[PDB]
């Protein structure tokens, strides 16, 4: 399952960060190994967001990052959505009637300082 140049707790930190991005942004540029490991992790989060209940919420909250916002919203207030609240109010209901496969990867180009092959991973 792809060690990614890191120890066991740094791999977990890095994945927890890259999947909370893409929940907040829905489209991201990364290398090609990270993108595959992340497709697996993010879709595991979406099938908990579709389950809906309290037990599923507390299961996801062990993996989604906390003090991050994702706001395009104002009726009249400063009303913030929490990137776990988005998972449960927005992204689950979106993919209600689709079975697995909520993402897709495209290949672009090697990075200048590296020759690392880069990639875009998006949702629909």
Partner 1 sequence: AVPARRTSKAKKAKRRTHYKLTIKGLNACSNCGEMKKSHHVCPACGHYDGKDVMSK
Partner RNA sequence: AGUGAACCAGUACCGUGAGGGAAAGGUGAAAAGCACCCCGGAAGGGGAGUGAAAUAGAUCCUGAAACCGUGUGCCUACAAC
Partner RNA sequence: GUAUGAGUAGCGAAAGACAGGUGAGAAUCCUGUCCACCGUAUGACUAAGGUUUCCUGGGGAAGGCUCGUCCGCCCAGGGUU
Task: Give the annotated binding-site residues.
Answer: 21, 67
Residue given tokens 């690392």 in the structure block: 116
Residue 52 CB, nearest distance to partner 1 (Å)? 31
Please identify, using beta-carbon distances, which residue of 90 and 109 lies nearer to partner 1: 109
Please identify, using beta-carbon distances, which residue of 57 and 65 lies nearer to RNA: 65
Q: Compute the CA torsion angle 103, 109, 115, 117 (nearest 10 deg).
A: 20
What is the DSSP secondary structure assignment for residue 77, as one 8-state letter?
S
Residue 15 CB, nearest distance to RNA (Å)? 9
Breaks after residues in the chain, judged by C–N over 2.5 Å: none
Smallest CA-to-CA distance from 100 within 39, 15, 52, 57 is with 39
Residues making contact with partner 1 (CB under 8 A): 106-109, 120
Q: Which does 112 bind (CB under 5 to 8 A by kind): partner 1, RNA, none?
A: RNA
Tell me how far the alpha carbon of residue 6 is from its chain's centroid.
20
Q: Which does 25 bind (CB under 5 to 8 A by kind): RNA, partner 1, none?
A: RNA
Residue 45 CB, nearest distance to RNA (Å)? 16
DSSP string, 12-37: HHHHHHHHHTTTSSSEEEEEHHHHHH
Residue 15 CB, nearest distance to partner 1 (Å)? 25
Please identify, using beta-carbon distances, which residue of 80 and 90 lies nearer to RNA: 80
Please identify, using beta-carbon distances, which residue of 56 and 105 lies nearer to partner 1: 105
């Amino acid at each position: 399952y792809r060690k990614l140049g890191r120890t066991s707790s740094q791999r977990k930190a890095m994945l927890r960060d890259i999947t909370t991005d893409l929940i907040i942004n829905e489209r991201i540029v990364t290398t090609e190994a990270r993108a595959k490991e992340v497709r697996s992790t993010v879709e595991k989060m979406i099938t908990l967001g579709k389950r809906g209940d309290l037990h599923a919420r507390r299961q996801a909250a062990t993996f989604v990052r906390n003090e991050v916002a994702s706001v395009r919203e104002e009726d009249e207030s400063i009303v913030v959505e929490s990137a776990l609240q988005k998972l449960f109010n927005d992204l689950g209901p979106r993919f209600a009637e689709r079975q697995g496969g909520y993402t897709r990867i495209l290949k672009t180009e090697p990075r200048r300082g590296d020759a690392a092959p880069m990639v875009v991973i998006e949702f629909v």
